[PDB]
Design a protein around this nucleic acid. Structure first.
Length: 97
RNA sequence: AGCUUAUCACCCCGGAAUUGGUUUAUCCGGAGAUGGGGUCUUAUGGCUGGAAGAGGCCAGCACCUUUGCUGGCUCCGGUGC
């Protein structure tokens, strides 16, 4: 499912974690996608799409909290929002998601 | 009273697994650490003014007395379940 395609871009294309990075990354247009965990509060969430819509960047919502999102990416620690800098062999940018 | 001074807390850069900081007592970190640089409360503490002409310890003077003058030092530290 959506976990497998994340598990392939982890080493085929550069990416980033955290929140301050995602806000910084999309400023110059280097972000093609972001992922928002359901655990984050709406006010914290409401930033991302407003910055994303200014960059014409699609926003993908994640079914689950930040605890599980970090495991899906491949890091033992947890991540609230994930931004994809550029996809590799994966097709996360161009898919039903 | 002037200058100055701490934990805690917060801010800018930065980005983390070969996970790391860390209290006597294991909490914290992508809701962003460790690190580098700063801000803040001023309990407390330090120098200075108050204030050494104050207080204290000592030597001479002679006053049936009422009393005083001349004077010196009033300094530098250390440790602690």
């Amino acid at each position: 499912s959506i976990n497998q395609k994340l598990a392939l871009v982890i080493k085929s294309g550069k990416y980033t974690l955290g929140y301050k990075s995602t806000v910084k990354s999309l400023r110059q247009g280097k972000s093609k996608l972001i992922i928002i965990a359901a655990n984050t509060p709406v006010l914290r969430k409401s930033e991302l799409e407003y910055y994303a819509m200014l960059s014409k960047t699609k926003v993908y919502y994640f079914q689950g909290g930040n605890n599980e999102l970090g495991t899906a990416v491949g890091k033992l620690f947890r991540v609230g929002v994930v931004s994809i800098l550029e996809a590799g062999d994966s097709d996360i940018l161009t898919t039903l998601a």
